[PDB]
Amino acid sequence: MNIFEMLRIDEGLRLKIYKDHEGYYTIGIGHLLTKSPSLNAAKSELDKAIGRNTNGVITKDEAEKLFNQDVDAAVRGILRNAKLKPVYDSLDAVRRAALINMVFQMGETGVAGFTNSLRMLQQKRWDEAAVNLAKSRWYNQHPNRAKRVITTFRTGTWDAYKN
Ligand SMILES: [Cl-]
Ligand SMILES: [Cl-]
Ligand SMILES: [Zn+2]
């Protein structure tokens, strides 16, 4: 398993613009288009992102392209951040993936705000981190997804994702 497969399971794949669980316009593999309520604004953004008049629909390949770009950006977000990098650098491969997943979902800034959990993870206090991470809006709004990520941080294995 790897980050891509992991995120593909958590985000799914949709080829037509859709409203996500937060009520925003998204497409492909969790690719947010706009937090605005206008579909037009979302189509504009889509065309801009893809480089063609899409009419709100894209191909698998195009979705995969947005996805590669998005995963790249999450990583770069991590590496650039003073609070995230040192943690990331302390972790094993599986756990790094769980950090990336969160950054992809919520943004570098968002994750950087989990001071306490970050600190526990850096100290390798897994069980503690996992409890702390669950005390969040993130967990409460996405219990199944959040449980898969937290487990991954807890065990360092891909178990939550096997299926
Ligand atoms: Cl793009
Ligand atoms: Cl969920
Ligand atoms: Zn959400």
From Swiss-Prot:
Optimum pH is 7.3. It is found in: Host cytoplasm. The active site is at 11 (proton donor/acceptor), 20 (proton donor/acceptor). PANTHER family: T4-TYPE LYSOZYME 1-RELATED. This is Endolysin. Transmembrane segments: none annotated. GO terms for molecular function: lysozyme activity. Changing residue 11 to N: Loss of 84% of enzymatic activity. Endolysin with lysozyme activity that degrades host peptidoglycans and participates with the holin and spanin proteins in the sequential events which lead to the programmed host cell lysis releasing the mature viral particles. Once the holin has permeabilized the host cell membrane, the endolysin can reach the periplasm and break down the peptidoglycan layer. The keyword Hydrolase applies. Belongs to the glycosyl hydrolase 24 family. Induction: Expressed late in the viral replication. Disulfide bonds: none annotated. Changing residue 132 to M/F: 2-fold decrease in enzymatic activity. It comes from Enterobacteria phage T4. Changing residue 20 to A/N/S/T: Complete loss of enzymatic activity. Changing residue 117 to F: 10-fold decrease in enzymatic activity. Keywords: Antimicrobial, Bacteriolytic enzyme, Cytolysis, Glycosidase, Host cell lysis by virus, Host cytoplasm, Hydrolase, Viral release from host cell. It catalyses: Hydrolysis of (1->4)-beta-linkages between N-acetylmuramic acid and N-acetyl-D-glucosamine residues in a peptidoglycan and between N-acetyl-D-glucosamine residues in chitodextrins. Its main location: host cell. GO terms for biological process: cell wall macromolecule catabolic process; defense response to bacterium; peptidoglycan catabolic process; viral release from host cell by cytolysis. Substrate binds at residues 32, 104, 117, 132. Its EC number is 3.2.1.17. InterPro entries: Endolysin_T4_type (IPR034690), Glyco_hydro_24 (IPR002196), Lysozyme-like_dom_sf (IPR023346), Lysozyme_dom_sf (IPR023347), Phage_lysozyme-like (IPR052619), T4-type_lysozyme (IPR001165). CDD domains: T4-like_lys (cd00735). One of its GO terms (cellular component) is host cell cytoplasm. Changing residue 117 to V: 50-fold decrease in enzymatic activity.
